[PDB]
């Protein structure tokens, strides 16, 4: 994990997230690995959810391999579980409301 | 006006309403319109068309395959069958176009 845990200004264009310990999240962003850890757990989601739209399907699939490309649910303490259809769509990883297609 | 000769025949105006209702009676068309439909339609055709979709910070390129049969039977009954399948443009599995994982 990081050795610098709460020293960075808020990043902009992040593309990955990683759990190193039970309290610190590591956002892989173009400036590097910016780590954060709040006072409380069950607020890691407030940091991770701001960059969920930048996740690709392979990163999502390798965050939980045995779940077979089904959308993932972000738990409050940062853990990943397999989603269910009645879970909230804002806390679901990889599911979509409208497919962003375009014809050539 | 060969292109406009059979543009608005009763079969092509009746089939969208037939497919959108649970019942449309037992007789809808006549024999002359069935002959017109048999004369104006190809037996079979297939097209491939290409569309890109935005997957996270990346993209996925995919193909709609649209194939269709048009037929007139011996009892002057018309038929128009359409198969529309979605494929990934380089044969990749569990992609965004095969499985968008939509929520309604």
């Amino acid at each position, epitope marked *: 994990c990081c050795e610098f845990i709460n020293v960075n200004h808020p990043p902009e264009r992040c593309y990955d997230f*990683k759990m190193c310990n039970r309290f610190t999240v590591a956002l892989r*962003c173009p400036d590097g690995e910016v780590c954060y850890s709040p006072e409380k757990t069950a607020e890691i989601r407030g940091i991770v959810t701001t960059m969920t739209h930048s996740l690709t399907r392979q*990163v999502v699939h*390798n965050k939980l391999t045995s779940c077979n490309y089904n959308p993932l649910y972000l738990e409050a303490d940062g853990r990943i579980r397999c989603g269910k259809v009645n879970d909230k769509a804002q806390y679901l990883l990889g599911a979509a409301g409208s497919v962003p297609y375009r014809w050539i | 006006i060969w292109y406009l000769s059979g543009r608005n025949q009763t079969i092509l105006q009746r089939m969208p309403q037939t497919a959108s209702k649970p019942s449309d009676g037992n007789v809808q068309i006549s024999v002359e319109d069935a002959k017109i439909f048999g004369a104006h339609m190809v037996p079979k055709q297939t097209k491939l068309l290409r569309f890109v979709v935005n997957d996270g910070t990346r993209y996925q390129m995919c193909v709609m395959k649209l194939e269709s049969w048009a037929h007139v039977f011996r009892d002057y009954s018309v038929s128009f069958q359409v198969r529309l399948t979605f494929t990934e443009a380089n044969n990749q599995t569990y992609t965004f176009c095969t499985h968008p994982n939509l929520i309604v």
Partner: antibody
Amino acid sequence: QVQLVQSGAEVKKPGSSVKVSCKASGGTFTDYALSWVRQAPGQGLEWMGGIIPVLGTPHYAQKFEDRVTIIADESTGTVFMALSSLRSDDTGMYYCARGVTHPYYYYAMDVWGQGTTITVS
Amino acid sequence: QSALTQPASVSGSPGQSISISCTGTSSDVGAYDYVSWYQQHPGKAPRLIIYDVNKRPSGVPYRFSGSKSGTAASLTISGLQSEDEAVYYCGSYTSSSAFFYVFGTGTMVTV
């Protein structure tokens, strides 16, 4: 087999612009992806940009967005590089590169040009 | 990362097999696969010896052998000869917002 042929070597004064051209042969030009890889003499390789022809969006790196412009004009398999605000760190070895296995997806970097030298001092 | 973390130089002896390592992030290598390798002699253009992870084109020799485990990748060159003395780079497709292709720092394999 697909072949790649670049332009000649160039000396550039600081504060100028460069117009590097690349041509290809023996392959499907539009479906497959093209890219430009620059290396300094004291540095390794670096992907800076590329284009898949007739897609509408060339791709740029974040270190080259404000200076590098990519044009894929002409009916032949050519591509053109307009880079502005030349500095001393822009001196190096440039390579046209193109893939032949997987179209549209920047997966591998199959064929390479012989390269050009852009020297700024 | 800005580049794949790669050694500076590995100098294995002739007649032996050597292994070149490459460690990247879980958004570059190990998620997308497509771990490509490149060869550069000092005057020549780069040459693709291994693409995908293990696919080896017919135009490159049989001796190279690439693999991926976890977020790490390895290239085992068996039976080192004098032609192998070159700079070897790694490369991968990425989900990074900064760019699209990640290039390794390059190992100078001197025989």
